[PDB]
Each structure stands twice: as structure tokens, then as C-alpha cells.
């Protein structure tokens, strides 16, 4: 996250860091066995840590799962990132508690001009590179469909949508990947890509989640 400030400890309880050795993208924890994620983030022998705040360093609310099966989107398109939607399920349920706990899939899409919560362990510098340990925030709107097409001319879908400022200096970043984007309390959003980070008039670009919601609902009741 570029530009963004520290969450705080398990402030942000729906978070979930993919780890394969090595944390490479987050995830959102929608039910006590299931994780939502980027397609672009498959890989083979995923483990699932919950409860993280400093990757690094064992502090007593982490609950280290791993995975049993991930399905990425039937239609995903590697070279469009076009649903760009992953989901992964737990060898066992996690244990839900006030630190730990699931983000409600949304009933409806949010509009532009609403404000979100996006968050991750990505790089926090817009050239260079430095990651952090711990969980970085932002607060970021999402944009007019007409602002995210004029900014990325020929790449947006109706599965993606523009969240952050045009003016540069705050937005998502490579480690943010299959992160969160919470709006209204409900998961709207998906780290999906950009064009470099926080550069100005090329705003971070997130799957669509409302748009999965049945994908999603009926791959959980039938796995
Ligand atoms: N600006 C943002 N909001 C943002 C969000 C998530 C990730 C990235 C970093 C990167 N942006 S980039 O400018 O480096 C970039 C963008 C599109 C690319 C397409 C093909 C090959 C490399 C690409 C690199 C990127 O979009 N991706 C997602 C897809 C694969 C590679 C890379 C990642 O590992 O996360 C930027
Ligand atoms: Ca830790």
C-alpha cells in the first residue's frame, strides 16, 4: 500500500495473508473455511494465515490453515486479467473470534463516490521497494466507470472498477494482490492490478465483486 498508514493490530480481521513459504498476496476470509483471492495469485501449496498483523513475527493471534482446494474463476483470462477471482478452501474451519472474522459478500454494487477500505502487506513505495511487516490501510473512492475507461483506455470490463486518486500518491501495489476493498461493510472489491503504483492518472484497478456473488454462493454449497 503506497501512501497509506499502519491498521493497527487485527483491526482489519477479515484479512488473510497467502503464504507459500513466503507471503505473496492477501485474501479475505468470507466463512469460517472459505478464502477469496485474485486468480492471478494461484499457486500450489498455499497455506492460509489468519489473525496476522507483523508477518514476521509469531504474536499470538494467528491461525495457520492450508488449503484444500482452490477454483479459479472458470472464465478468468490471464492476459485481460478478466475475472480475476479466486476461491480457496481450508483443510478446517478456522476458529472465529473478534480478531478473526468473515466479510459479508455484497447484496448490492457500490457506487462511485463510495468511500473503502483497502489493505495489504504490498510495497509501500511508488518507485523503489520496501515491504512492510505489518498491515498497511487505505481509505480510497471508487471512481466513475468514465474515469477509470479514460484512464486505462481499452482494459477495464464490467467485472473491474477504479478506486483511488487520480492525483497519484496513494493506492495499492505488488503484495496487495487478491487484497481486500471493503465498502459499506461488505466486500466489493479484489486487488487486482494497475499501471506501476500511485502514479498519477492511473488509478489501482479491483475485480468486481458483486458480480460473483452466485459464482461464488454456489461453489461453496457444492464444495
Ligand atoms: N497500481 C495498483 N493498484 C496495483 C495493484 C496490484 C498490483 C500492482 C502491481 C502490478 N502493476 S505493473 O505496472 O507492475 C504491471 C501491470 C500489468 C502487467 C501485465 C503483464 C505483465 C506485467 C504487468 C505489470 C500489477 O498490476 N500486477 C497484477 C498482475 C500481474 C503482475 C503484477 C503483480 O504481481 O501484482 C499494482
Ligand atoms: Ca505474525
Known amino acids: 500500500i503506497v501512501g497509506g498508514y499502519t491498521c493497527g493490530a487485527n483491526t482489519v480481521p477479515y484479512q488473510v495473508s497467502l503464504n507459500s513459504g513466503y507471503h505473496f498476496c492477501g485474501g479475505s476470509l468470507i466463512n469460517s473455511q472459505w ?3 485474485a486468480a492471478h495469485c494461484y499457486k500450489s501449496g498455499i497455506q492460509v494465515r489468519l489473525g496476522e498483523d507483523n508477518i514476521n513475527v509469531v504474536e499470538g493471534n494467528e491461525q495457520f490453515i492450508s488449503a484444500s482446494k482452490s477454483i479459479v474463476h472458470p472464465s478468468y483470462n490471464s492476459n485481460t486479467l478478466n475475472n480475476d477471482i479466486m476461491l480457496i478452501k481450508l483443510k478446517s474451519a478456522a476458529s472465529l473470534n473478534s480478531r478473526v472474522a468473515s466479510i459479508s459478500l455484497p447484496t448490492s454494487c457500490a457506487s ?5 477500505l483497502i489493505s495489504g502487506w504490498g510495497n509501500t513505495k511508488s518507485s523503489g521497494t520496501s515491504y512492510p511487516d505489518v498491515l498497511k490501510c487505505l481509505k480510497a473512492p471508487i471512481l466513475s466507470d468514465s474515469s477509470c475507461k479514460s484512464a486505462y483506455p481499452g482494459q ?3 467485472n ?6 487520480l492525483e497519484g500518491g496513494k493506492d495499492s501495489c ?4 487478491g487484497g481486500p476493498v471493503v465498502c459499506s461493510g461488505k466486500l466489493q472489491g479484489i486487488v ?3 499501471s506501476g503504483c500511485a502514479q498519477k492518472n492511473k488509478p489501482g484497478v479491483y475485480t468486481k465483486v458483486c458480480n460473483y ?3 461464488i454462493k454456489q461453489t461453496i454449497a457444492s464444495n
Open 192 to 194: 487486482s492490478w494497475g
Open 160 to 165: 473491474m472498477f477504479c478506486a483511488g486518486y
Open 213 to 215: 456473488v452466485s459464482w
Open 174 to 177: 505488488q503484495g496487495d494482490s
Open 35 to 37: 478464502v477469496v483471492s
Open 112 to 116: 462511485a463516490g463510495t468511500q473503502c
Open 156 to 158: 477495464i470490463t464490467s
